[PDB]
Amino acid sequence: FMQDFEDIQKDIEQLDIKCAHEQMNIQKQYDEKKKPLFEKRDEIIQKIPGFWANTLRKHPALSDIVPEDIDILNHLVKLDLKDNMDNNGSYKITFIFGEKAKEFMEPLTLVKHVTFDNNQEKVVECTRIKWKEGKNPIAAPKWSIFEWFTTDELQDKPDVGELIRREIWHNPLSYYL
Amino acid sequence: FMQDFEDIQKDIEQLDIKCAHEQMNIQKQYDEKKKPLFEKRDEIIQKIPGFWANTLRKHPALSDIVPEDIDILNHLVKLDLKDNMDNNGSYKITFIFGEKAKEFMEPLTLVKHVTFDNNQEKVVIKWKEGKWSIFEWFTTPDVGELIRREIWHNPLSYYL
């Protein structure tokens, strides 16, 4: 009877396996249909002066970042989420900065690629920002958003990755307003 | 531009809506295949004295509950989740209690709906004389989700 319950739950899980599979096939139908929309949206962001700067810091968890952060972020021309690469919650976020950001740093493309193992997070890739002399804002209650570009864990320090993926990326216009 | 942006989100949103619709439609086809299998599972539980009473509190979140909940939970004969009610993710949970629970309450079936609209949540017992509380969640620990997210799909996990 302990055994009967296991038998029944085999049968249930087999149906969920097959349900999730079909749903995923549809899921990845539309993921692909979205790709164009996300790209046509990036083109609009390009035409909206300092959009990400004014978007990001309207999120409560990011609102109290150093003012210096804004100086660089004001040249964030492009932000992209590459979501759902693993079936495990994996993603890659990419910051592309206009030329003027060369006053403060190198390179102009920052990437951070992340996976998960046992609900512990692991950073697979991360750009080493090379701040110009006297231009590092991590050198200034507050923290610097660019502190998010480490390999180390972030204890009691906002997961800019997760907030982006789960709250901001789907509709950043909400936050711009 | 502010209109071009507002337009592309609707383009995205309704691609989202669709997707959710077709995915649901699939959920239902399997919710129906599974219905007989819940009947046997429920049929089986009835032959494991105090199954639910013993399954819930082995969940770390509920492990802090007051002894008197157990008294009632011991007379909980049937528990059912009815999930994904709408494109938002609304569910209905129903506790049916045996008749020895008359000692403690009316009515003996307790239904609870948590309803989500296109963004947020709107949510919706008379004790006899002497009778946190797990039933303290029957106001207006998110035990309703502890059940649906984690327990329901395979409760025997927690029994063992």
Residue numbers in the entry:
A (entry chain A): 29 to 168, 181 to 217
B (entry chain B): 29 to 152, 157 to 163, 183 to 191, 198 to 217
Please give sentences taken from the publication describing this entry.
PfNapL and PfNapS do not interact with each other and unlike PfNapL, PfNapS is able to deposit histones onto DNA. In the present study, the structural basis of nucleosome assembly activity in P. falciparum was addressed by determining and analysing the crystal structure of smaller NAP in the parasite called PfNapS.
A construct of PfNapS consisting residues 29-221 (molecular weight ~23 kDa) crystallized in orthorhombic space group P212121 with solvent content of 55% (the asymmetric unit contains three dimers of PfNapS). Each monomer of PfNapS contains domain I comprised of dimerization helix α2 (aa 33-73). The monomer also contains domain II, which is comprised of α-helices [α3 (aa 81-85), α4 (aa 99-102)] and a β sub-domain containing 4 anti-parallel β-strands (aa 106-158). In PfNapS, 23 residues of the dimerization helix α2 and four residues of α7 and α8 (which lie in domain II) contribute to dimer formation via hydrogen bonding and hydrophobic interactions (Asp32, Phe33, Ile36, Gln37, Ile40, Leu43, Asp44, Lys45, Cys47, Glu50, Gln51, Ile54, Gln55, Gln57, Tyr58, Lys61, Lys62, Leu65, Phe66, Lys68, Arg69, Ile72, Ile73 and His210, Pro212, Leu313, Leu217 respectively). Similar to PfNapL and other NAPs in the malaria parasite, PfNapS is also evolutionary distant from homologs in yeast and human. The length of the dimerization helix α2 varies in all the five proteins and PfNapS has the shortest such helix comprising of 41 residues. Also, the r.m.s.d. of PfNapS is lowest with hSET at 1.6 Å indicating high structural identity.
